[PDB]
Automatic annotation (TrEMBL):
One of its GO terms (cellular component) is cytoplasm. GO terms for biological process: L-ascorbic acid biosynthetic process. This is Regucalcin. Residues 15-271 form the SMP-30/Gluconolactonase/LRE-like region domain. Keywords: Calcium, Cytoplasm, Hydrolase, Metal-binding, Zinc. Its EC number is 3.1.1.17. The keyword Calcium applies. It comes from the Eukaryota. Mg(2+) binds at E17, N159, D211.
Length: 307
């Protein structure tokens, strides 16, 4: 039995999201995708800080080679933020590229570096809905030439990403599809192909929607279940295998990242935003951050964006 601990020091988030563990500094970064804020937590020293901007944000990833610089999303722009990690505002903002300059009602959502340091991220309608709503999103990667490439389209809610330990597969979540997809990934050309469902929620009586995900060193996926009050562990060796379920007190679990000095603590974000048609009463929906220990696996440190 794992132990789930609420991290009291951190408070409650409207939509806590995009956790990233920087192993060199033993620091957890994450966002609130509605409150327009970035967050830094240093567990060993019990230090917490935040930063404010005036656009919607969805990820924050340290830039390789440049301490104090971070690649972030600002609505539809991918930008570099220079930040001292403690002041309430960045020192400077440099825009890299607007991925969808003429689609005014879209925003970036989940994003992550692949193991080579390429940023992958997807867009969605700002007013996307569950279970049905506008489907306007696409999946991109950003090349070290600051030019974007599109890999998938017709995405409702661009969400969790992960890659296999051998760089042969990519895993991807469009929350609106209520499944986890797998793709063949060609690291040489950064092309994906052969889209196939890996895990379908309806086949296993799993409530809610897949949101963020990460992979452990045994190659298993850990998937946050928004409106399922849980994280699930699924196999990548064989389709449609549910390995384990860990209940999280917050119903709107949003994402996951391994961290801690041995990479065997799982940090879990959630959302306190109370939605129309929730399966959960308001008193339950808080938006805390959790630490899960005793899972018996390790994960990997967060990869920096090379850019
Ligand atoms: Hg910040
Ligand atoms: Hg910041
Ligand atoms: Mg998400």
């Amino acid at each position: 039995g794992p132990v789930v601990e609420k991290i009291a020091e951190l408070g409650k988030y409207t939509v806590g999201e995009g956790p990233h563990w920087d192993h060199e500094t033993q620091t957890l970064y994450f966002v609130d995708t509605v409150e327009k804020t970035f967050h830094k937590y240093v567990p060993s020293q019990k230090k917490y800080t935040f930063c404010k901007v005036d656009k919607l944000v969805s990820f924050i990833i340290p830039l390789a080679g440049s301490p104090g610089r971070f690649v972030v999303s600002l609505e539809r722009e991918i930008a570099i933020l220079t930040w001292d990690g403690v002041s309430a505002a960045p020192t400077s903002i440099e825009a890299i590229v607007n991925v969808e300059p003429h689609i005014k009602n879209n925003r970036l959502n989940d994003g992550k570096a692949d193991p080579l340091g390429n940023l992958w991220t997807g867009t969605m309608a700002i007013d996307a809905g569950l279970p049905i709503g506008p489907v306007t999103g696409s999946l991109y990667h950003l090349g070290a030439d600051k030019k974007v490439k599109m890999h998938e389209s017709n995405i409702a809610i661009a969400n969790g990403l992960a890659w296999s330990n051998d760089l042969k597969k990519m895993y991807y979540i469009d929350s609106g599809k209520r499944r986890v997809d797998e793709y063949d990934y060609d690291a040489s050309t950064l092309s994906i192909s052969n889209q196939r469902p890996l895990f379908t929620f309806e086949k296993h009586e799993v409530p809610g929607y897949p949101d963020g995900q990460t992979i452990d060193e045994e190659g298993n996926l850990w998937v946050a279940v928004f409106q399922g009050q849980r994280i699930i562990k699924i196999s990548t060796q064989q389709p449609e295998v549910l390995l384990d379920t860990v209940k999280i007190p917050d119903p709107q679990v949003t994402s996951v990242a391994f961290g801690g000095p041995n990479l065997d603590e799982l940090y879990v974000t959630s959302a306190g935003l109370q939605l129309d048609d929730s399966s959960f009463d308001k008193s339950l929906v808080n938006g805390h951050v959790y630490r899960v220990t005793g899972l018996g696996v390790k994960g990997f440190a967060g990869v920096k964006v090379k850019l």
